[PDB]
């Protein structure tokens with residue numbers, strides 16, 4: 001298990017997300033689905049010139065998995081996935097300059113819902129999650145588990161769990177007062193409102 005410090009700007013962004021009073025929390029789902037959609041476009045694009053890039057799985061989809069017992073909402077995609085370097089590098093983002101453009105916009109009059117326009121939408125997961133686990137598999141690397149409960153640090157370890165083939169799994173360990181995001185009708189309403197034009201099938205799993 002390797003422990004890393006977030007760059008100062010990212011720690012500030014996460015602290016801003018966690019501590020600012022902002023009721024429109026549901027936007028986290030749109031932001032994670034949009035990242036999944038970009039990762040899927042990336043593997044589809046590479047597959048246009050190299051069909052063997054899809055040897056790790058031909059299905060290009062997004063699964064939403066609520067688990068009331070574990071109090072987790074999992075977003076799974078079969079996108080390009082991430083290497084260890086991408087994971088350490090703010091999960092494939094330009095998060096340092098992205099955070100500065102975002103925080104400058106917030107001072108000007110913008111709101112937290114515009115986070116995705118600054119390429120740091122992943123961090124909106126902390127509007128609803130106390131802990132985020134990212135399981136990822138890229139064709140050019142091994143399977144890794146990224147994890148952070150914020151607090152200025154994140155961990156990275158080789159994942160010896162269930163192999164995924166290729167893609168990313170975002171496990172949101174929801175805050176006690178954010179369990180509405182495990183309800184079928186609430187997830188369905190959010191998907192329909194903010195993600196109606198995503199070019200991949202979005203499957204909302206049901207529970208026992």
Ligand SMILES: Oc1ccc(-c2n[nH]c(=S)n2-c2ccccc2F)c(O)c1
Pocket residue numbers: 032034035036038039040042077079080081082086091092093122167168170
């Ligand atoms: O919630 C996420 C977060 C990241 C990924 C991901 N996997 N591979 C690549 S590239 N991305 C990616 C997407 C958008 C911006 C930056 C990125 F690094 C994902 O599939 C889901």
